């Protein structure tokens, strides 16, 4: 009886195994755009993905991870609200059963069709496992997806999904360039929070871009053909793998823009 997003093991149950679920800096949150404070001290975000080396794509049972070689300083996030240098380890998405839901963060209560998370760890902690034990261990860049025109830079991901339909399947996935998933503007909101799946560790500086990217109805439909179940089990479509907004508590969301 492990955690998931099904009818009996979903987000409202997670606190029983992971009491940090009811903690002081949980994610995601609703971003109240009127209450977010412009912070002129924030720097432009620096996203340096020119030498990113993707390796593999994995159906992890909850979403799919596109994994990067993070054994050298290649693909890094810095600047913005961050001190030092964070290295890209993987990206994944969260999405809905319908276009009107699927994002984890919300903007003035608006839910997007999906949300991309590029996960990076702080190089001062040496590796990902040590970084997640620290309050400034991770930086996750969050990008909203809306349904409209296709994103040509997403198609290589969508095309490989039929090869990893079920939990625990992986496929080689080299030479994928995550710069093709970025919107034009790097204006962002930022706040201190958590992983959004167990173990829900409070180790993330969230950086959520204001401008969504557009993907086509066909691209998102292919996400919804994935399965939460293993091969040779009855089909459980991989949809609605998003955690809802959590209480903001004693936190301020800062904006990089006025």
Active-site residues, by number, are 62
The span from the CA of 16 to the CA of 237, in Å, is 25
Residue 87 engages Zn ion in binding (rule: CB under 5 A): no
CA quadruple 70, 71, 73, 79: dihedral positive or negative? positive
Residues 100-129 that bind Zn ion (CB under 5 A): 117
> φ, ψ for residue 164 (rounded to 5)?
-130, 45
Q: Which of 120, 76, 112 is nearest to 95 (CA)?
A: 112
Nearest distance from C-beta of residue 20 to ligand A1IEL, angstroms? 12
Q: Closest separation between CB of residue 28 and Zn ion, Å?
A: 9
Q: Which residues contact 236 (CB under 8 A, 6 or more apart)?
A: 6, 227, 228, 229
Residues interacting with ligand A1IEL, by CB under 6 A? 60, 62-63, 92, 94, 117, 119, 140, 195-197, 241
Residues annotated in a binding site for substrate: 196-197
Least Å distance, CB 40 to ligand A1IEL, is 29
Cβ distance to Zn ion smaller for residue 50 or 128: 128
Q: What's the DSSP call for residue 48?
A: E
Residue 164 and residue 171 in contact, taking contact as beta carbons nearer than 8 Å: yes
Between 52 and 132, whose beta carbon lies closer to ligand A1IEL? 132
Joined tokens for residue 182: 């970025």
Decide which of ligand A1IEL, Zn ion, none touches 60; Cβ closer than 5 to 8 Å per partner kind: ligand A1IEL
Which of 52, 200 has the CB closer to Zn ion? 200
Shortest approach of ligand A1IEL to residue 67 CB, angstroms?
A: 10
Cβ neighbors of 193 (< 8 A, separation 6 or more) are: 25, 26, 27, 28, 29, 202, 204, 205, 206, 251
Of 148 and 222, which CB lies nearer to ligand A1IEL in the complex structure?
Answer: 222
Q: Which residues bind Zn ion (CB under 5 A)?
A: 117
């Amino acid at each position: 009886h492990h955690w998931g997003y099904g009818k009996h093991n979903g987000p409202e149950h997670w606190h029983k195994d992971f009491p940090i679920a009811k903690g002081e800096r949980q994610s995601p949150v609703d971003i109240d755009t009127h209450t977010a404070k412009y912070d002129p001290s924030l720097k432009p975000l620096s996203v340096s993905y020119d030498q990113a080396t993707s390796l593999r794509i994995l159906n992890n049972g909850h979403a799919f991870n596109v994994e990067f070689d993070d054994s050298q300083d290649k693909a890094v996030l810095k600047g913005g609200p961050l001190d030092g240098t964070y290295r890209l380890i993987q990206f994944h998405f969260h999405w809905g059963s319908l276009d009107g839901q699927g994002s984890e963060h919300t903007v003035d209560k608006k839910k997007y069709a999906a949300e991309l998370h590029l996960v990076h760890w702080n190089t001062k902690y040496g590796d990902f496992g040590k970084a997640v034990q620290q309050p400034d261990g991770l930086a996750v860049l969050g990008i909203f997806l809306k349904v409209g025109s296709a994103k040509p830079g997403l198609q290589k991901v969508v095309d490989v999904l039929d090869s990893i339909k079920t939990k625990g399947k992986s496929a080689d996935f080299t030479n994928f360039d995550p710069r093709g998933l970025l919107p034009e503007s790097l204006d962002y909101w930022t706040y201190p929070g958590s992983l959004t799946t167990p173990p829900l560790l409070e180790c993330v500086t969230w950086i959520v871009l204001k401008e969504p990217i557009s993907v086509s109805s066909e691209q998102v439909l292919k996400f919804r053909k994935l399965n939460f179940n293993g091969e040779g089990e009855p089909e459980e479509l991989m949809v609605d793998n998003w955690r809802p907004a959590q209480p903001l508590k004693n936190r301020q969301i800062k904006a990089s823009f006025k």
